[PDB]
Structure formats: structure tokens, C-alpha cells
Amino acid sequence: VLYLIIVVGMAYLFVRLPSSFLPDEDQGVFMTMVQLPAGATQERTQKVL
Amino acid sequence: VMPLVISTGAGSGAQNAVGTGVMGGMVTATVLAIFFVPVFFVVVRRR
Amino acid sequence: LTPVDVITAIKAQNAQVAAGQLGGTPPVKGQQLNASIIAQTRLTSTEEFG
Numbered sequence: 001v002l003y004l005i006i007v008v009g010m011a012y013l014f015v016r017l018p019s020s021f022l023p024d025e026d027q028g029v030f031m032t033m034v035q036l037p038a039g040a041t042q043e044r045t046q047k048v049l
Numbered sequence: 050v051m052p053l054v055i056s057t058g059a060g061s062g063a064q065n066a067v068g069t070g071v072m073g074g075m076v077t078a079t080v081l082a083i084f085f086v087p088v089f090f091v092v093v094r095r096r
Numbered sequence: 097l098t099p100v101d102v103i104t105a106i107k108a109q110n111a112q113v114a115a116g117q118l119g120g121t122p123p124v125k126g127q128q129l130n131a132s133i134i135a136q137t138r139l140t141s142t143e144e145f146g
Contacts, residue, residue, distance in 0.1 A: 003085065023062035041119065041127050 110139050 036045050053068030115133035139145050 003088075023066065025060055025062055028059075039130060041130055042121065042123060043125065043127065 111136060112138060
């Protein structure tokens with residue numbers, strides 16, 4: 001009967017454990033993006049870059 | 050899987066996840082099934 | 097009048113025109129506007145065609 005509760009705690013654990021699909025790995029190369037208010041010019045974004 | 054569980058190099062996340070997920074199940078599957086399956090067998094045979 | 101004239105007129109004053117941009121590339125140093133331009137739009141209602 002004690003072994004019985006060994007089962008139910010599993011369900012308690014299933015709530016605690018979240019769900020994802022695929023981890024993020026260290027590829028060594030990453031990206032960065034710059035977005036400016038509309039109506040701007042090429043010089044402004046070039047200076048920001 | 051001992052080297053897998055402790056890694057920080059390239060592709061570390063996948064080996065970490067696989068090693069932990071396997072070792073955590075196995076440590077309890079080897080230390081508790083020996084003391085549990087005879088009780089299960091005798092109970093299932095009695096009924 | 098002739099039907100050819102009607103066809104020519106309806107072709108001429110129901111058309112699409114591409115104008116461009118105010119502040120296009122290449123720009124001159126010291127520019128701060130990059131708006132677009134709208135030139136002509138196709139007729140929509142029957143009264144406009146009338």
C-alpha cells in the first residue's frame with residue numbers, strides 16, 4: 001500500500017515538469033537586429049549600426 | 050554517461066538532457082526493482 | 097466621334113502610374129525623409145467612369 005503513493009507522486013511531478021521541444025545550442029555565431037522609427041533615413045541606421 | 054552529465058562544450062544541452070534522463074531513471078530502476086518485483090509476482094500469482 | 101477614340105480615352109485616363117520615392121537611394125548627406133509617392137489610381141465607381 002505504501003508503494004501505492006509512489007505512483008501518485010508521479011502525477012504531482014508531471015505538473016511540476018514543463019514542456020519544450022528542442023534546446024538552444026551554442027553554435028558560436030549569433031545575430032542582432034536594429035529597427036528604427038518609420039520615415040527614417042539610411043544615414044541614421046548606418047550610424048546606429 | 051558520466052562524461053555526458055558534466056559538459057560545457059559544443060552541443061552540451063543534448064548530451065546533458067540525455068544523460069540525466071537516462072541515469073535518473075536507471076539509478077532507481079536498479080536499486081528498487083529487485084525489492085519490488087517478487088512482491089508483485091506473488092501478489093499476481095495469489096489472485 | 098468614333099469607338100477608337102473612346103477606347104483610346106478609356107485607356108489613357110484609367111491607368112496606373114509609378115512615381116517613386118522622396119529621398120531615394122543614393123541619397124545626399126544630410127537627409128531625413130524617405131516617403132513614397134502616389135501618382136494615379138484606377139477608377140472605382142461608375143460615376144468616375146461617367
